[PDB]
Amino acid sequence: SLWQFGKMINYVMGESGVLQYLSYGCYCGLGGQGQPTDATDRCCFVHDCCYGKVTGCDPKIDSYTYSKKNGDVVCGGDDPCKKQICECDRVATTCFRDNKDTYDIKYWFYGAKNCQEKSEPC
Template sequence: MFQGALVGLLLACCVAIAYPSPARLLQSSNNYLCGKRNSLWNFGCMVYCTTKLDAFTHFNNYGCYCGFGGSGKPVDGMDECCMHHDQCYDAARANGYCGKLALYTTSYKWTCFNRTTPICNVHQINKCSEELCKCDRQASLCFARYTYPKRKPGCNK
């Protein structure tokens, strides 16, 4: 468990250092660069598409499930979105579509329609890309149903 969290943290740090924010990429004329990144980066861009919030700032360490890992009872609707997202990724892995690292490193193609709605391209690179895009799309649309709180909640374990 600790090793997985450490790998996730290292990946997130590398992504944060190497790339500009998803908000800056989507504020440009199109989201071409968002669609060329790995799934972790694409997820951040999708969240920005639906909520106009930076996923790495607003949702990392939010509640019990947003960020790497997760357990306990979700603290609110947004945290529940993250729990379902984790379960979706777990299913992609359990079904043999994605390996552990592939969950964060595989890219997929999508478009931010009308700057509010993520749409996964029908033709993906492979089944892992297809499943990750579906998981990320569901989570980003789920986040859009809620208003972000004034204060980011922690986990009450």
């Protein structure tokens, strides 16, 4: 669930992470549109596309099983569908980490208006 996605971000990117990543560019959040602004936003675009692949459960509100250890996150449990949600979130988190160097506050709480164009196909 997004509640877990937030915790996962805070653990991997630090306590200020949720505020830093849950409203960025055109896709960071949930249910974006238009063209990704930069690499970090591309992470969220892939994340959104990932949630779109989940059909046996609700990636937005269904809770999954995961662990925290040495800065990283590990997906657990035995439910195939829930494990798939967790994987979508885990990949997005490491992606934020790998692209930290180009994060631009210019796209922080960017505003939907600039994203109102045909969305890039997954």
